[PDB]
Amino acid sequence: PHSHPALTPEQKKELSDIAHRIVAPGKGILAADESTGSIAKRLQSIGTENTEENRRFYRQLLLTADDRVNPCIGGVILFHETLYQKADDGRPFPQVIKSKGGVVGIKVDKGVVPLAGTNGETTTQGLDGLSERCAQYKKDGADFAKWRCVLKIGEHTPSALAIMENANVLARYASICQQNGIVPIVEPEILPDGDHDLKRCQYVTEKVLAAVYKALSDHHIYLEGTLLKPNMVTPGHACTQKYSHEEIAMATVTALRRTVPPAVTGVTFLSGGQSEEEASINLNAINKCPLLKPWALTFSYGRALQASALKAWGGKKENLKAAQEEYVKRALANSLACQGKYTPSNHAY
Amino acid sequence: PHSHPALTPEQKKELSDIAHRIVAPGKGILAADESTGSIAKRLQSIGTENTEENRRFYRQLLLTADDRVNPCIGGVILFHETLYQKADDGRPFPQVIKSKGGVVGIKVDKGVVPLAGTNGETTTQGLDGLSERCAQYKKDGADFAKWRCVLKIGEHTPSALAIMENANVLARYASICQQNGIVPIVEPEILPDGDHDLKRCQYVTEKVLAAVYKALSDHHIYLEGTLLKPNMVTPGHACTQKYSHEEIAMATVTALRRTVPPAVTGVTFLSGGQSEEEASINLNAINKCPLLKPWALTFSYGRALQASALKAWGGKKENLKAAQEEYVKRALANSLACQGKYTPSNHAY
Amino acid sequence: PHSHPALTPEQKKELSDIAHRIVAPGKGILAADESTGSIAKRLQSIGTENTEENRRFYRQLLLTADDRVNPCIGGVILFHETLYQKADDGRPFPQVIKSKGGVVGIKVDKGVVPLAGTNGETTTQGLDGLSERCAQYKKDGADFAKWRCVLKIGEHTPSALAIMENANVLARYASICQQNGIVPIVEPEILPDGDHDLKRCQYVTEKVLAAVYKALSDHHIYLEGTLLKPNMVTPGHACTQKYSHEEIAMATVTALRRTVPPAVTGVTFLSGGQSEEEASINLNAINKCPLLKPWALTFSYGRALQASALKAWGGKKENLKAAQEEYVKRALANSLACQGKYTPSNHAY
Amino acid sequence: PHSHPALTPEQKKELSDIAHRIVAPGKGILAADESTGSIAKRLQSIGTENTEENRRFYRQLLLTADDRVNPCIGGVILFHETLYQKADDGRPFPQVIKSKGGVVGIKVDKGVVPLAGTNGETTTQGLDGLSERCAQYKKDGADFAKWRCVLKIGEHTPSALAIMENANVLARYASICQQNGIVPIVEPEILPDGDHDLKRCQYVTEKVLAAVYKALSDHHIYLEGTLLKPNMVTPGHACTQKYSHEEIAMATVTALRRTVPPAVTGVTFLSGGQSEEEASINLNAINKCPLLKPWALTFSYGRALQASALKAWGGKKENLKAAQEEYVKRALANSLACQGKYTPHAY
Numbered sequence A, B, C: 001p002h003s004h005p006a007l008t009p010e011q012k013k014e015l016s017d018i019a020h021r022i023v024a025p026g027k028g029i030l031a032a033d034e035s036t037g038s039i040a041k042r043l044q045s046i047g048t049e050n051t052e053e054n055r056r057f058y059r060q061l062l063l064t065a066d067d068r069v070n071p072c073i074g075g076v077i078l079f080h081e082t083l084y085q086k087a088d089d090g091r092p093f094p095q096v097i098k099s100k101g102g103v104v105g106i107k108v109d110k111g112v113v114p115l116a117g118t119n120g121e122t123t124t125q126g127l128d129g130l131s132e133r134c135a136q137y138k139k140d141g142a143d144f145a146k147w148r149c150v151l152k153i154g155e156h157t158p159s160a161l162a163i164m165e166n167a168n169v170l171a172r173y174a175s176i177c178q179q180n181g182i183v184p185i186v187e188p189e190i191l192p193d194g195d196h197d198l199k200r201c202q203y204v205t206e207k208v209l210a211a212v213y214k215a216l217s218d219h220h221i222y223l224e225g226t227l228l229k230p231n232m233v234t235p236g237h238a239c240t241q242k243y244s245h246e247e248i249a250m251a252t253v254t255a256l257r258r259t260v261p262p263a264v265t266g267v268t269f270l271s272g273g274q275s276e277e278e279a280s281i282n283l284n285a286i287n288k289c290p291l292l293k294p295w296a297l298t299f300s301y302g303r304a305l306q307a308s309a310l311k312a313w314g315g316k317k318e319n320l321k322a323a324q325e326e327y328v329k330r331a332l333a334n335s336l337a338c339q340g341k342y343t344p345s346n347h348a349y
Numbered sequence D: 001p002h003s004h005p006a007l008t009p010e011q012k013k014e015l016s017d018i019a020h021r022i023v024a025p026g027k028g029i030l031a032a033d034e035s036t037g038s039i040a041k042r043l044q045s046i047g048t049e050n051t052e053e054n055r056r057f058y059r060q061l062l063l064t065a066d067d068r069v070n071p072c073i074g075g076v077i078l079f080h081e082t083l084y085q086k087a088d089d090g091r092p093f094p095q096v097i098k099s100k101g102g103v104v105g106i107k108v109d110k111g112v113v114p115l116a117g118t119n120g121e122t123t124t125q126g127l128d129g130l131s132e133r134c135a136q137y138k139k140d141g142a143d144f145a146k147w148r149c150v151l152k153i154g155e156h157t158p159s160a161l162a163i164m165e166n167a168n169v170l171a172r173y174a175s176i177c178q179q180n181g182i183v184p185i186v187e188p189e190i191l192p193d194g195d196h197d198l199k200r201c202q203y204v205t206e207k208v209l210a211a212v213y214k215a216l217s218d219h220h221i222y223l224e225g226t227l228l229k230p231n232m233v234t235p236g237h238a239c240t241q242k243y244s245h246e247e248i249a250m251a252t253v254t255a256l257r258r259t260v261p262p263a264v265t266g267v268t269f270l271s272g273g274q275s276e277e278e279a280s281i282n283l284n285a286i287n288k289c290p291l292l293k294p295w296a297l298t299f300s301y302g303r304a305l306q307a308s309a310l311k312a313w314g315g316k317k318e319n320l321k322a323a324q325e326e327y328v329k330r331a332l333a334n335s336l337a338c339q340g341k342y343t344p345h346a347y
């Protein structure tokens, strides 16, 4: 029952200022941190060989887009490899991002592993040596980080063990990040797979997020220096009932209002399986929801910002500006959506 | 991980409507629910005998003040006895309250009991047969309830057992109230006794409230149909260090922003040991605090609304209007304070 | 992390001595504590009116059986009414029990109540005023108590909430009993209803018992002064697969070896839906199970000791000796079974 | 509320048989798994240079003692390096251990790390890639593993966070081991530092162990295929009050009887700060305690088995026979103590 402060006032200020910079009005996050296994599939989807040089070129493609994205992008998440690559002009990518007014982020988790005794559930590893990696990433230009936990809605899932363990590892990761001046993004993703309906996803999301923020409290996490990266509340991919974007927005906002303390600086949704345009409408509806939302509601999009750019690129160097244009389109679209400015019964929740 | 709805949409709307009526702008709660053992202390302090008649008269004195209190008082909490008494004009007190535009509340707990193996810590009893009582109180005009848990800041307290146990019984009480159409006020009071400083009270309050709302989630409580009745974050009564009202307001709003989900309809502060004027000033500073506060921040005052009325009464029949005037003063003062309209480095928190 | 002892060594000795007397070798408990609503059903099965006198006579019939039961019955559980009734010769029933070498027990819970938001699950009430009741029961001759919690195996049950809440209320009850020199019997009954198999029951029983003993630790319960009243591990009533008595015994002892600390003085199984002969055979098989069992394994039987006696009685005063003989037969049978002397691989668990 | 079995019956049998071999009557564990930084302190204490060869030689010294230790030693815990070193006759140390009737163990954690917001409390790291390491150690002859968590008795410690977090990481480590056919030794150590008395240690030990076994239940651990490595219940190093060996035994057995389920196969005590003889006397008292003890109560000793051997060696190759004799003495002493045959309600 006695306080042994984890952070000084100066440390708290740095973390709060970083978090606010990332989700400042009209701004969101580009998730360009696809692991080397995940980036392989993207390149194979456009028949391009997965070489370090192709990965560098594609990342450079997104980071050097014209200055129209500067007011759209508050932060860019990178994979380890990309953090130490350089643009053609010799500038390290963290410097490119900074010079366009962005914060640099680093994904630090090491993937999921199975939880024995469960119905195919997982936790996430990566805590070993994390403090030294974070101190190193801080030196090399990173100011926030990402850690992804995965949960699945099934007949017996997510179980009490899975929720508790994923919530606990998220808190540990957040604790280590804040000790090294890094803002942790807490991502408890509930997959959209299955035939569950909207209200079931809302129920599960509410139970996961309540576990998350109890754990963050237990581990003394400074919420003003955190961000939340949740799934939107949506029906399962295999659900037959159809829902309006207004219903998606109402259920999403409702789940957050019931679990996310106001001290959290911002919520940066993941797009999941949504299409580029679907992810922009939904995010816009969420910001038009009449209910009171005491946190920034913006984006941390990977595919929903890159899908078109990747295809217009096709691996051909001469399609550089055509691909950048598709990326700039989505960045401008979602900069409007996270302000509710995008145009192409609460008791029931 | 499967939903079995505790409340229908129609039940939710009733509870939410009640909760909002109570904390509507400019309105607060009169706490006239002193148990017969506590009201005995009040009458003794003005040398008045503790008879049912004096208790009935004293309550009548407050409930029948002139219509300047109608926009100030959203709700009145009563003890069991008073709920079935009548004013001099024969009208049952619940009818008097409603006719003046107030909601009727009832205290339903049966006092504290010791927790074996702890250093003088307690839990609260009163769950047995609570559902049938609630159904009866509902019929007889009550629309919300009160339950008081007490925690103490000390060398080894509040302990993990004390926090877990009091949070859990509050959730049981709230669950039963909502099944019977009654809005539960959740009151986990941290006593101001001791020489602890402001930061220690803020730390305990943040830990206690995190446990409360995790327990409310585990028990499926509908937060829009609840109110929270917490202490303000203050130093101990015996703390040597001095603090401004702005500092108390900053500590209080920070603790709440870090724990209370936006879905909670209102926060009705208890006055504790504060004087009448001190309680109104602090509530006013709380409502002027620049930070974002997504709930109503109003009052549930007993002593802070009654102290002057009681002394002016003194048991004399002829001092009725002198006493009623002192109560109308405090009702008007606190109606202004809960709007920030009353005049007599956040990272360091 | 600081001990504030709940009990003195003298208090500990008293509780431990009571507990060992009850489950001394060859001894078990007669459960004659049916509520007036539960005993009414039994009387109706023999077309006998539910009057206080018939209830008195029936209880007298059991309590005054001939002295062949004295070494069989270490304790007798009574309902409130029966604790204050007298035999025909004027002797209070507690004195009847004590003079035959038994300990007097009292049922102290006030029945189950529904948990809102669950699939028909319950918790139990009765804590209100329990401390005053226990001290009074102690004065009037009772030395141990019983509290029944009920959990159900279903598609989504027992839930996390139901396990947590019932474990917590059992520990509260146990703490209060021990403060008044009363040995608590902790009864977390998992019902046999449903089509579940033996493995499913063993799993649930293991998780229930683990939660029970964690709660008892959190509440500072003295295990040597407690007894456990669990179900045997059995298939559901509606299960099609058939199991031998040796498999039931192996599953039961395995579940217990994995969850019950050796400090627990004894285990007094409930019979559930089992017949008189079935409950005796299983208990015998349990005590012959080759595994190591560091606690007494005996019986706390109601129907499995009374069924034949109740039928032979039929309400007729003249069937006294015929009825008593049937009760004595089962008491002698079960006294042999709890020693493994009654006659009418493990890695797969 | 639905079972998804973590282990098959075949997997349970393998784990149970391993665990029973390690703690078979008269047998205990030699803890020779000192990390490279801890063994550096040991060698420095006898003015010996910390070289791979010196570490190899010292470990060989212990593992090749004469066959009088065979009935005393059910298991040997090794550090990663030693697992892949060889004796002078070319045999890998795991083969040496097995040929003398012992089971090979491996330390798999990666040290303690601070818990932010606490008063100097720690958790332990080492889960990343533990499944692949365990599978590899199994191929290379290891059949059980060790993971150490450390807790401290202070004015505000151990806190709810530290107990919960350490209990949870222990359960994760135990879960991964059992999926790879390795018996986990669960070691939640409460340090003897401080001026606390016996009662305080008994209280803390009971709370820590209750949390450990709830965690292990939550994570579906097969207790019959696990071992416990706890401290003995003793007063703090700086406590003025004196206690007899019978009181230490009574407090230790009582703590265990109130927390450790009978299904656990064995309890292998750590020696902590105790001298070789103090550890042997206390272990003997524990095994003679009149209360009923449904698990093997033996030793997992490092310093309490090696102290005299290290000093008799002194780094000199010609003291090989002298050093080995001192080790065989303690192995014989403690093999008797864990049978209770060694002689030189208030809880």
Ligand SMILES: O=P(O)(O)Oc1ccc(C(P(=O)(O)O)P(=O)(O)O)cc1
Pocket (backbone or CB within 6 Å): A033, A034, A035, A037, A038, A041, A111, A148, A302
């Ligand atoms: O679902 P897919 O179509 O296979 O594509 C994926 C899958 C997972 C991820 C993860 P990772 O980078 O850790 O692999 P994250 O979304 O957290 O970046 C990224 C892209």
Ligand SMILES: O=P(O)(O)Oc1ccc(C(P(=O)(O)O)P(=O)(O)O)cc1
Pocket (backbone or CB within 6 Å): B033, B034, B035, B037, B038, B041, B148, B302
């Ligand atoms: O501090 P005191 O001078 O003793 O006055 C008191 C003490 C307690 C209460 C309780 P109760 O009504 O349950 O007794 P509550 O604040 O909940 O009304 C009310 C007034």
Ligand SMILES: O=P(O)(O)Oc1ccc(C(P(=O)(O)O)P(=O)(O)O)cc1
Pocket (backbone or CB within 6 Å): C033, C034, C035, C038, C041, C148, C302
């Ligand atoms: O099995 P049934 O036919 O429904 O009869 C019953 C049902 C419940 C009980 C309870 P109670 O006495 O508290 O009501 P307990 O098992 O605790 O004696 C006793 C007999």
Ligand SMILES: O=P(O)(O)Oc1ccc(C(P(=O)(O)O)P(=O)(O)O)cc1
Pocket (backbone or CB within 6 Å): D033, D034, D035, D038, D041, D148, D302
């Ligand atoms: O107390 P010291 O004098 O510092 O010696 C020590 C300290 C710690 C250990 C650990 P480690 O080998 O993991 O560091 P373990 O007890 O687990 O072997 C071993 C020896």
